[PDB]
Amino acid sequence: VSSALFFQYNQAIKPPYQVLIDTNFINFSIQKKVDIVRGMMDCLLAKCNPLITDCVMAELEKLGPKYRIALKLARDPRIKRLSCSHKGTYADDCLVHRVLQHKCYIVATNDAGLKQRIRKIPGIPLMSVGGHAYVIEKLPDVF
Amino acid sequence: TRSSVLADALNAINNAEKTGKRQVLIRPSSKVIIKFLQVMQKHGYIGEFEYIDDHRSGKIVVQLNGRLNKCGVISPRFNVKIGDIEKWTANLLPARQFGYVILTTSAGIMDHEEARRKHVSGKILGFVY
Amino acid sequence: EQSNKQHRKAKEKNTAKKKLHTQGHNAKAFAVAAPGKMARTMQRSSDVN
Amino acid sequence: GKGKPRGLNSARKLRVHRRNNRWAENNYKKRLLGTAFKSSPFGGSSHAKGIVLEKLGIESKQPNSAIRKCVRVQLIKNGKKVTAFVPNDGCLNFVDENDEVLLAGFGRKGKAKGDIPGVRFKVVKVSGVSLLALWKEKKEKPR
RNA sequence: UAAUUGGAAUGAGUACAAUGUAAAUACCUUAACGAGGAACAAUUGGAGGGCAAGUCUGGUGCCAGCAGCCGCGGUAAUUCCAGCUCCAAUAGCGUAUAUUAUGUUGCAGUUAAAAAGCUCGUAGUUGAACUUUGGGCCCGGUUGGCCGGUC
RNA sequence: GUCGACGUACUUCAUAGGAUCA
Ligand SMILES: [Mg+2]
Ligand SMILES: [Mg+2]
Ligand SMILES: [Mg+2]
Ligand SMILES: [Zn+2]
Numbered sequence: 001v002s003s004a005l006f007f008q009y010n011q012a013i014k015p016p017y018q019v020l021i022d023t024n025f026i027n028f029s030i031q032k033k034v035d036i037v038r039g040m041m042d043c044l045l046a047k048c049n050p051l052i053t054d055c056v057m058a059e060l061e062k063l064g065p066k067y068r069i070a071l072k073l074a075r076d077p078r079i080k081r082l083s084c085s086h087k088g089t090y091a092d093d094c095l096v097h098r099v100l101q102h103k104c105y106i107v108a109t110n111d112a113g114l115k116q117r118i119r120k121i122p123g124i125p126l127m128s129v130g131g132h133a134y135v136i137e138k139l140p141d142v143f
Numbered sequence: 144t145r146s147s148v149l150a151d152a153l154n155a156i157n158n159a160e161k162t163g164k165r166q167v168l169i170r171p172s173s174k175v176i177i178k179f180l181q182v183m184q185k186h187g188y189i190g191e192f193e194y195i196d197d198h199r200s201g202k203i204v205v206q207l208n209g210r211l212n213k214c215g216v217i218s219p220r221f222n223v224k225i226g227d228i229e230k231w232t233a234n235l236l237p238a239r240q241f242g243y244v245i246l247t248t249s250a251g252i253m254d255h256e257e258a259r260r261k262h263v264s265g266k267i268l269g270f271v272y
Numbered sequence: 273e274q275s276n277k278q279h280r281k282a283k284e285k286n287t288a289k290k291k292l293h294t295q296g297h298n299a300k301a302f303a304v305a306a307p308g309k310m311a312r313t314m315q316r317s318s319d320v321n
Numbered sequence: 322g323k324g325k326p327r328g329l330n331s332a333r334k335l336r337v338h339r340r341n342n343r344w345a346e347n348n349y350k351k352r353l354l355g356t357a358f359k360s361s362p363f364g365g366s367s368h369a370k371g372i373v374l375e376k377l378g379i380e381s382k383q384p385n386s387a388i389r390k391c392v393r394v395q396l397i398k399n400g401k402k403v404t405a406f407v408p409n410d411g412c413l414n415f416v417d418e419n420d421e422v423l424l425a426g427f428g429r430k431g432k433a434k435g436d437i438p439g440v441r442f443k444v445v446k447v448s449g450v451s452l453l454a455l456w457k458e459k460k461e462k463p464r
Numbered sequence: 465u466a467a468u469u470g471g472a473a474u475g476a477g478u479a480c481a482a483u484g485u486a487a488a489u490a491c492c493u494u495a496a497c498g499a500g501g502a503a504c505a506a507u508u509g510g511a512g513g514g515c516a517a518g519u520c521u522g523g524u525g526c527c528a529g530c531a532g533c534c535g536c537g538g539u540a541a542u543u544c545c546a547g548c549u550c551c552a553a554u555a556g557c558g559u560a561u562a563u564u565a566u567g568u569u570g571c572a573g574u575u576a577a578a579a580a581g582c583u584c585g586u587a588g589u590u591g592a593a594c595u596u597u598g599g600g601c602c603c604g605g606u607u608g609g610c611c612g613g614u615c
Numbered sequence: 616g617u618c619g620a621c622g623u624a625c626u627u628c629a630u631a632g633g634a635u636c637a
Contacts, residue, residue, distance in 0.1 A: 030229055030237045038239070073238055198493060200593045216486055218322075219329045219568095234569070280576060285344035286621090287578095288345040294622065300344055303353045308563095310355060315562065327568090331589050335492085335568070344568060367561035383519060384531060412535090413629060425560040435530095445559075453558095 002103060007139060010123030012104050016047035019127060020098060021079075022109035023059050023091055026070045028129045036079065040108075043127070043134040050083040051105070055094035092117075099124055106139065150216045152176050152203075153269060158191075160207045167207060171200030171208055173235040175268070180205065182245055183214065183271050186254075216269040220247070224265045228255050235270055242272025362426065362441060364381060365379045371396045373420045376413065379403065385410050387437045388424050393443070395421055405442040408452065415462060 004012035019040060029036060040048040053076060055120055060071050073079075084094055094115045095107060107118055118124055125139035126135040136142070152169045159167045165247035169176070172176070172194060180203070183189050190206035223231060223246060227243055236242040248265035250258075260262060292299045304310050326334055344350050351357045378388040390410050395402040405424055407413060415427040416422060422454040423446040444452060449461065454460045 033234070033237055035239050069237060080156075144591075148592065173593060218325050221329070278576090282415045283577095288342070288347075289368050292344060292350070293620070299354060301413065303380075304355070307355075311352065311357065311562075314355070314358075318368060319561090321366075323571095324573090325568090332568090334589070336495055339566065339568095345565060349566085356623070361561070363561080365561090383518080386530080390592060428560065443560090 004102070005123050008019075010103065010125075013106065013123075013125065013139070014141075015044075016049060017044060018049045018105050019108045020082075020095055020105045021050055021052050021056065021060055021074075021096065022107070022111065022114065023056055024110045024127065025061070025108045026073060028110055030070055030073065032129055032132060034129060034133060036073065036076075038128045039051070039129075039134045040127070044137055044139075045064055050079045050108075051100065053081055053082050053094050055086055055089060056091045057081065058088060058092045091128075096121075106136075121123075144231070147216065147218065148173055148181060150218065153214050153216055154172075156205060156207070160211055165207060167205045169205065170200060170202040172203045175252070176203065179245060179268060181245075182252060182254060183211075184242065186271075188214070188271055197252060210271055214269065216272040217267050219245070220266040222269065223230075223264050223267045228258065228264060229254075231267060233257055235272055244270045348361065365418075368423050368425045368445065369396055369398065371403075371422050371424050372403070373416050373418055373422055374402055376416075376420065378411075387435065387440070389413075389438070391400075391440055392416060394424065394442070396424075403442060404440055405444050406440045407444050409456055412452050412456050416447050417450065422447050 002012075017040075020038055020040065023037075029039070036050055037048060040050065050077075057074065060067075060074050063071070082098075084098070086094055086097075092109075092111070095109070095114065096117055099105060099107060099118065103121075103123060106125040107114075109115065109118075110128050115126060115128070118126055126137045127134050127137075128137070144178040148171050149255060154170070155169045156167050177194070180189065180192060184191070188211045190205055190208045192205040195202050195204060217235070227245070228246075231245045232242075233246065243250065243256070244267065245254050246258060246265055246267045248258055248261075250261055250263050252268065253261075358365045369427075373397045374393050377391045378386065381389045382390070387406075390407050390413065391404050392407060392413070393402065396404045405422065408428055409414070422444045424442040425445045427443045429440050436443050447454070447455070448464075450460045450462055455462060
């Protein structure tokens with residue numbers, strides 16, 4: 001119950017944002033041909049700093065060589081690499097622990113299960129690629 | 144029957160590099176296949192290659208080296224104006240700063256960021272990324 | 273306990289582009305040039321009757 | 322290729338092929354032929370007049386029951402007689418017999434504990450005045 | 465939580481006047497009046513709560529359910545949910561009907577929409593490769609680096 | 616004529632699967 005949060009406003013999230021990418025955000029970006037950095041600019045209408053965690057990068061490197069273009073996208077120089085103090089576990093678990101320990105990232109992901117478990121935590125907006133672009137759900141500073 | 148010879152060439156390269164082979168044999172070979180391949184070669188997607196010569200259409204042998212993710216042809220060679228360059232490269236590339244759309248202008252066969260500089264346009268052939 | 277599988281039949285003459293000719297005429301040919309205006313004026317004048 | 326042509330001189334084929342296989346789309350043939358409203362109960366209209374033919378459940382003991390609230394109403398365009406709801410059961414005193422009720426669709430979004438399948442209309446104006454303006458005692462019914 | 469009360473503030477309105485305008489009216493400006501329930505009396509919708517010496521229905525008792533503007537008196541008298549609690553939009557708010565968020569890009573056809581029984585065939589769409597390639601010299605644009613002479 | 620073949624309009628039938636607990 002941090003000093004920033006209102007009832008559900010969560011006013012420590014502000015421009016420029018910091019998003020956390022899941023492993024199937026990348027897949028549906030490559031599939032629907034949106035681009036990471038400009039796609040988040042085109043929805044949030046603010047600067048962005050996509051972040052990728054050591055658990056997620058390990059998972060990408062675990063996929064193999066059929067998915068090497070997504071790995072090429074993830075080692076891009078202007079996607080920063082947040083390092084994580086973990087054993088090295090499943091990606092979605094590492095995302096949930098990051099979210100609970102700081103409550104100032106928005107989470108870009110596409111699996112339904114991780115969507116539910118994030119939605120329990122109050123004040124964490126939740127980007128996801130749908131249709132043709134990056135729709136954002138629980139952010140009260142949209143337009 | 145056989146209509147696009149370039150489509151056959153790029154499909155044969157694509158198949159025989161998916162499966163991991165090392166050199167490809169593509170029969171026939173127009174001037175367009177040589178120039179499209181020299182454009183792919185300049186950017187490092189294929190190794191050298193060589194035209195072997197019978198007294199017929201002629202064959203090519205390409206030396207692949209791994210770095211090729213996809214290549215293809217756009218089949219009606221659509222006329223592309225100068226803003227349609229960037230609508231085309233947003234439709235058919237998975238991230239808008241790698242991969243090259245290749246197009247046939249009055250100044251040669253070239254990728255798109257060379258046809259931006261020279262300020263030309265023309266028809267559209269294919270793509271690599 | 274032997275059940276055979278259904279042979280899914282093949283229709284007879286009842287296809288949405290053949291229904292249009294079953295009445296007196298070719299009903300595709302008696303249409304309008306602006307269906308939106310036909311709709312909004314038809315509704316309003318219905319209410320004013 | 323796929324089923325369709327693709328050469329750069331076949332717009333005429335593609336344009337005719339869309340112009341034929343477009344009459345096989347029920348909303349298209351519905352909205353050009355002008356069939357689009359026999360779905361709707363009233364004609365083309367949005368309200369419809371009617372004569373109060375009689376009351377139903379005027380001898381029903383259980384108060385505020387739905388069959389207490391329903392009158393039976395003849396429409397003046399067709400001649401067909403239907404049943405109609407009435408809000409606020411006290412407003413059965415306002416409609417008598419040979420009133421002109423002006424009916425509107427009931428259009429209910431949901432179905433309650435003891436409701437009725439079959440009432441599809443509802444009474445809006447009784448002999449010129451409106452039932453919210455008689456029940457709220459603004460106006461009164463001009464006989 | 466407030467339910468009394470203390471003075472300060474102002475315009476809706478009314479108005480000498482001037483301005484406005486062809487002439488007026490109104491705005492803008494302004495003497496004099498003009499706020500306690502500031503009775504100088506905001507609205508449209510939907511969700512809940514209780515209302516018994518009441519009625520009605522059903523039953524494995526005192527119950528349940530519907531409902532409750534209907535009770536024992538009383539209507540110049542009863543002075544009662546002071547006048548039940550929330551929620552949303554707000555000088556705006558609701559209801560009905562429609563409509564809105566076919567495939568060029570970009571659909572589907574073995575097994576659940578849909579490949580004509582078959583081949584020939586005119587229009588239509590579509591159609592293999594090839595013809596000056598390559599080198600040498602000069603000129604400088606416009607950048608980028610070493611530069612920054614400058615007050 | 617509670618007539619047939621259509622053409623419109625509408626209705627309805629088919630929804631549970633795993634895991635743990637009792
Ligand atoms: Mg079938
Ligand atoms: Mg022919
Ligand atoms: Mg040719
Ligand atoms: Zn971790």
